[PDB]
Write a protein that binds this ligand. Structure first.
Ligand code: KRS
Ligand code: KRS
Ligand code: LYS
Ligand code: LYS
Lengths: 500, 502
């Protein structure tokens, strides 16, 4: 607009007039919090002309009460400080009073020097002697996010962070929560590792990958969909307890709970099974909730702050729902065995139509089972609840159930119908594992884009002996959503993927 | 030529069909092997507590026998070895015949044992076992050490073998964890906030590197993997977060060698109201303190040619030498560069200089790439101890603020150690007019064939138009820092799964 062109013209006039133009360094006397923590309990009207302090922040308010007085609010590091600029106090060596202040606009980052104290009304203030424009804002900013549509908050995240305290709070909470989680596992003697995000062969999750290419090696590559296959090789290597926190990359759908890159944690624990992992998940998550909120019952608004509120209860232990048993309890009928037979496939198709459940493609036993548990089970998980004992056909890297035929020692954690955790007793028998890979390879051949190719390097690693192991993954972003009561993953990711 | 793996598959089939233990789901250990040694490592020779039954587990590193009645194992777990003494008179027959139980065990198997704690008469910390369980067999005949491998490339391609046999490799990755924690703590204590910015970018930028290209099908849009987080991190300072850092992977689609892996771990931080003078001071305090933490002093060994070859000492005592970019080139040439540095007269001059001193000519022959080539020849070669090369020309520093005293230069530094780049930092450019102009010049170089030059990023220019406060920013190559702390001359030693050819 004209505001931007005029600002560029102003800065040109300032550069040519020998006046301060983007100064390289401004030495602040102290932070704005610190200034408030030192002078916040002074008597009203107190000043100290024996002390000169330099302060800086972004201008949020300019009010010229008269020709001799200008009131500024600056803001920085979560603290507001008022500046009172009296013409009688102005340092004429920096320019005439009207000139110096004529160059300051709301939104500018600026520095003031002056004397500390509080005003007569009692508001913490600096009684400024000069003003330095450090970095002008070339755009007319709104007062609050109300003056922006609200997808600007996602596409220009600096504007959300500059005007909206609620958003700064979410990302501070995100860091506090990841700190808590690392500590939890560091205390247990885990070793944090990093495994490749560029893979020759992708695997470890049910997802379509991103495809790329390395020009000097002349080979196609994939971004990792999960670190699982590498992490387990470190247990073969004897590291005993490892974890990784980083990005996965999945090339599929974007919605309220899906962003193409998302932060995941995986850990592998030699000699655990999935029963140890349940106890561990409850201890980790209830403790973090308690740490963050001060109690285990926390509000959650699925439709935003003026919509209905749900109170999620994280009190332990959590409800277990057996995968197949609860589907058959919803159906009033038993699935057909073997679970992956054509008869069962047909029966599940028929039940999905009967219960108005969108059919998947292909109509693999695994995808159909997913649809039925999406309908009959994932809908009962308002409080954190474990969905346990997933069928083998949908769990190619999960070890078989020691007692239930066709099942595995797997669990998923759901909160308010949304997946948070996925874990199992790790499959460590190479023969079965190869066969489950081949069934995956054939499903990919039959239209399952989310099916992974065989990874011979992983089979060879299992042939060197994976000790009995429990492994586990957590979608960190979705965890932040519950901890910060957002219902859109875009709220808990700084620069989410936006359509252009 | 190796029936060992076939027979082991056959052995395990027999076991499965005979109803014998076959890959038990859960083996509950009484304690870890390190806890065991802590509890019992000081008992007398010949001590045995037959009132205490314990379950231990580890990988078998050794099987020896004196009779058909007495078998000696060594098991290893969590950095500790414990001897298992299996006497037939103690053998629990409900688990099977003694000879049958132990003929299923091979060196390399993950196995559990149950028995009585104590020490052999010769004084070895031992469990006197009553049973053995095969938890996870090893189908391959293992070497005793990484010396028994066919090639040492096996250590990178099958890193589980390296970790299994070689304490030295295990120590490297513990040192890597320890150093990263130290670094996080240093910045957490300064009030920094850790952030995560996108590794999928619609527009790559923030470094001189060639990107990987990809595609998101639902968005139907081409994407780049990030070469650096710098342009998103600076937006967060515009945002007012004041002090941010990010520790994560960068992806660069270029050459692989001793100091370059296509993905590597970098740290970037941005500090409102710092300049590069502040950043040099912080670099010195952070890096020297970390070095002291690991090594107990500031003078540490390095073997650029291996552990039996020559050993040099790297001196981290502060303050570190400063080399001025253009001056040090000119002292090594014996004459001055032409001004402006980016003029055709100076491009031509610099071509004459690379040919005279037999410096491999860059392509394309941009002023920046020519100047980089001279610096790498005349300046980086002097950086044995940690040293700052400072005040880089603007033509090679599109995101660095102009130098407050030296025309054509910027307020930038790179940290070199043993001639390898460890850090890159500058007073950040926050003036949108010039930033746009240097962006257009980068697109001009990218057009002449400079695969390192980045295209203009309009989202970032618009961010700077909202006011980036004076700021200092900084990047650290963490893999290369570990190379120096751990004394490795190959980046493959400090990355668990490095990129390997076919
Ligand atoms: C690592 C796993 C553990 C299971 C919960 C969670 C699932 C995961 C699925 C997923 C897929 C995808 O394409 C994009 C996403 O943001 C997510 C996510 O947040 O969560 O993460
Ligand atoms: C973030 C930066 C700051 C300067 C040091 C270091 C440079 C970086 C260059 C680089 C390029 C590349 O293609 C592969 C690599 O492993 C590296 C590396 O380790 O170091 O990291
Ligand atoms: N790879 C799994 C997480 C770990 C499952 C247990 N090994 C996922 O992406 O969902
Ligand atoms: N982006 C730089 C590091 C930060 C430079 C200061 N902004 C690099 O990758 O080398």
């Amino acid at each position: 607009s004209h505001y931007t062109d005029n600002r560029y013209k102003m800065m040109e006039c300032i550069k040519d007039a020998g006046r301060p133009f983007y100064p390289h360094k401004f030495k602040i006397s102290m932070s704005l919090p610190a200034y408030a923590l030192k002078y916040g309990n002074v008597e009203n009207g107190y000043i100290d002309k024996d002390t000169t302090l330099s302060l800086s922040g972004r201008v949020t308010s300019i009010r010229s009460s008269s020709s001799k007085l200008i009131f500024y609010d600056i803001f920085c590091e979560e603290q507001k400080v008022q500046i009172i600029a009296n013409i009688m106090e102005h340092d004429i060596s920096t320019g005439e009073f009207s000139v110096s202040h004529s160059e300051i606009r709301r939104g500018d980052v600026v520095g003031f020097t002056g004397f500390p104290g509080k005003s007569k009304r009692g508001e913490l203030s600096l009684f400024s002697k000069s003003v330095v424009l450090l970095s002008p804002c070339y755009h007319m900013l709104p007062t609050a996010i109300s003056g922006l549509d609200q997808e600007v908050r996602y596409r220009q995240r600096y504007l959300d962070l500059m005007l909206n305290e609620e958003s700064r709070k979410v990302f501070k909470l995100r860091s506090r929560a990841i700190k808590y989680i690392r500590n939890y596992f560091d205390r247990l003697g885990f070793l944090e590792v990093e495994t490749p995000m560029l893979n020759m062969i992708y695997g470890g999750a049910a997802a379509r990958p991103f495809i790329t290419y390395h020009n000097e090696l002349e080979t196609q590559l994939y971004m990792r969909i999960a670190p699982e296959l590498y992490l387990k090789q470190l247990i073969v290597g004897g590291l005993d307890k490892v974890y990784e926190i980083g990005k996965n990359f999945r090339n599929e759908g974007i919605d309220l709970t899906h962003n193409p890159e998302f932060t995941a944690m995986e850990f592998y624990m030699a000699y655990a099974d999935y029963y140890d992992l349940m106890d561990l998940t409850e201890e980790l998550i209830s403790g973090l909730v308690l740490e963050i909120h001060g109690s285990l019952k926390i509000p959650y608004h699925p439709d935003g702050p003026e919509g209905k509120c749900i109170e999620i209860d994280f009190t332990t232990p959590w409800k277990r729902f057996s995968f197949v048993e609860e589907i058959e309890s919803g159906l009033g009928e038993k699935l057909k065995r073997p679970l992956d037979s054509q008869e069962n496939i047909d029966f599940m198709v028929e039940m999905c139509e009967k219960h108005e459940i969108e059919l998947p493609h292909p109509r693999t036993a695994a995808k159909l089972l997913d649809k039925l548990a999406g309908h009959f089970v994932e809908t009962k998980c308002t409080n954190p609840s474990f969905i346990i004992d997933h069928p083998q056909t949908m769990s190619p890297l999960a070890k078989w159930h020691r007692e239930k035929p066709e099942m595995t020692e797997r669990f998923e954690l759901f909160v308010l119908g949304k997946e948070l955790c996925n874990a199992y007793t790790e499959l460590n028998e190479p023969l079965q594992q190869r066969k489950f890979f081949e069934q995956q390879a054939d499903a990919k051949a039959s239209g399952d884009v989310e099916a992974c190719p065989i990874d011979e390097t992983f089979c060879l690693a299992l042939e060197h002996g994976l000790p009995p192991t429990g492994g586990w993954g957590l979608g960190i972003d979705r965890l932040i959503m519950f901890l910060a009561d957002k219902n859109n993953i875009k709220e808990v990711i700084l620069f989410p993927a936006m359509r252009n």
